[PDB]
């Protein structure tokens, strides 16, 4: 309802916000680590998860100070050892 998360085949994550009155896609944040993202999942408003072609699952936390210069940090990175193609929390 607030932003659009774009999963790039080369980049990790792209955060884009689309305005209603301006009607323009604005890119403000990115990620330093290049990842072959296959799928993505949403846990809550701030956390965005992503998969990998080889089995690398990571959760990216964005700082509260974002332009809703913004290189995304990583708090958890783990390799299963097998190819994971779906993430879902329930």
Partner 1 sequence: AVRVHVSYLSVPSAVSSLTDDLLKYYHQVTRAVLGDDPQLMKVALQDLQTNSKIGALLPYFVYVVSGVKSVSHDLEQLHRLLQVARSLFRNPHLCLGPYVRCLVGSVLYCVLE
Give residues with Cβ within 8 angstroms of 59, minimum separation 6: 43, 47, 48, 49, 74, 75, 76
Q: Which is nearer to partner 1, 61 or 79 (CB)?
A: 61
- Least separation, in Å, of the C-beta of 60 and partner 1? 17
The residues with which 17 forms a beta bridge, in sequence order, are 26
Please pick, from the candidates 10, 20, 64, 89, the single residue that binds partner 1 as defined by CB under 8 A: 64
Q: Which is nearer to partner 1, 38 or 66 (CB)?
A: 66
- Contact residues toward partner 1 (CB under 8 A) are 63-65, 69
């Amino acid at each position: 309802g607030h932003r659009v998360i774009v999963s790039d085949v080369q980049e990790s994550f792209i955060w884009v916000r689309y305005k209603r009155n301006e009607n323009q896609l604005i890119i403000f944040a990115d990620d330093t680590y290049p990842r072959w993202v296959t799928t993505a999942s949403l846990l809550d408003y701030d956390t965005v998860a992503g998969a990998d072609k080889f089995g690398n699952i990571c959760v990216v936390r964005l700082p509260p100070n974002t332009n809703d210069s913004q290189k995304a940090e990583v708090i958890m990175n783990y390799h299963v050892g097998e190819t994971v193609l779906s993430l879902q929390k329930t």
